[PDB]
Write a protein that binds this ligand. Sequence first.
Ligand SMILES: CC(=O)N[C@H]1[C@H](O[C@H]2C[C@@H](C(=O)NCCS(=O)(=O)O)[NH2+][C@@H]2CO)O[C@H](CO)[C@@H](OS(=O)(=O)O)[C@@H]1O
Length: 506
Amino acid sequence: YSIEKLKKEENSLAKDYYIYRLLEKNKISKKDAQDLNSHIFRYIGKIKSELEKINPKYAKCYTYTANTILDANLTCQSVRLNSLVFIASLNSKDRTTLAQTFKNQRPDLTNLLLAFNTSDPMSYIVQKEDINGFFKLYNYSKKYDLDLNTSLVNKLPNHIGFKDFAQNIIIKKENPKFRHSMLEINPENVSEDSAFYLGVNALTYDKTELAYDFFKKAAQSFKSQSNKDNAIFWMWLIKNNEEDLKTLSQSSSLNIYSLYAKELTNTPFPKIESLNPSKKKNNFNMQDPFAWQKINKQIRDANASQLDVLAKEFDTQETLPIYAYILERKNNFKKHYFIMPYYDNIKDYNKTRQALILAIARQESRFIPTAISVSYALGMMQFMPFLANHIGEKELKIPNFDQDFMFKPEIAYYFGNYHLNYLESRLKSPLFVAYAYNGGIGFTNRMLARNDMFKTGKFEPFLSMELVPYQESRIYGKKVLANYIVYRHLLNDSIKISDIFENLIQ
Ligand SMILES: CC(=O)N[C@H]1[C@H](O[C@H]2C[C@@H](C(=O)NCCS(=O)(=O)O)[NH2+][C@@H]2CO)O[C@H](CO)[C@@H](OS(=O)(=O)O)[C@@H]1O
């Protein structure tokens, strides 16, 4: 589509995507580009960069430099010193004068100014127990590491940056002195994700009673049933209390931990809804990405009555993904929908391969054929354009191939099969295939080559699943693995969950 036609659509990821495609080919002119920021839905990343190839209150403050900062007025000094890179570029003469100037009004700035006079700014800030400075320095450089006392570490969780700081250094196995120091955080001082990660940290040093206390505090504070189940599972792995396994087995959340608990207690498999519309198709275009962005907003805004009307409108085989998306919401996410749309395209693969394709598709797109992610992964199977083109143009040599072919379910399922087959041939387990599908086989190979990941051990393979070093893939693998178990069950191709976990140990 030309830019002027595209400008008439409502702002969305689909519109951004097509704006990006034009900017990619150098097909937008300067005149056209000028009003284009009001036409972008998410002005972040690749689209922001490609476009830029085409606060006056504080502007004067940016003429000053490291060499002239003391000539500036108090406001401008204050503004420039919000940058740690700038503070580090000063000399100690100027940092010491500015620290005096700002002592009473901006005491946290004063601390950093003086900190940067020393050879280790972090040690200086740690001595002060300046928590705000601690996180700014961590963001400045991940290289700082030192042993922290009990008083300091127990103040770190009262900052919004603690959760990602902890998660990051734990799952990446970085900053050993910080990590070891966090064994002294009192579980009363943490909750939710922070408590969970500290539980994971404690397990890596084999502090299992401490871990149990952290996981218990997570279980008591998490708002999502899925996260609560994950914490309860660790409570059970550590102390083996029958009531934890029982509670987990009765979860209405369908996830790997509730599923495994049901297997272990002989609890029946959860109820899965069965959708099979009588009508084959209607006039809605399931290959039109703009139409999906529009209807998605309509469904979000609908009350119960409006959802009933929409359900009737999309009650077809061709529109099944939208029908299921409507019913999820009408039932307030309390029912379990595991659809198998456009099934004629996968019916001749074996049932395990079907389950893996369905499991991936369900997590990626909820089967919406024109699904578009924030990084412009495309279609039901959420292929990145570079991969879709590689498979389509190089490997399969499809005549007149375009990346938008990924919006057609026959293509999405066929490419998904092709790529999953390559990943499986190298990784075996559906979990490892999932990690590699989302995060790339490069990161997955490097992770599995580690001597401390997915090898024999007391709490393995469950501990390794918590230490997958990229958050998105860590979560994605767990969700896809649950979906794979359910689809295998639905296809009468059930596998013992315990066998799946045993197959992860190398
Ligand atoms: C099927 C596919 O295209 N997979 C690619 C994946 O896409 C991911 C990206 C992800 C995505 O779009 N994430 C954002 C999701 S959302 O908009 O925040 O909901 N979904 C897609 C399939 O899982 O991105 C990674 C990393 O680039 C690639 O690894 S690489 O080979 O080492 O480059 C990998 O090949």
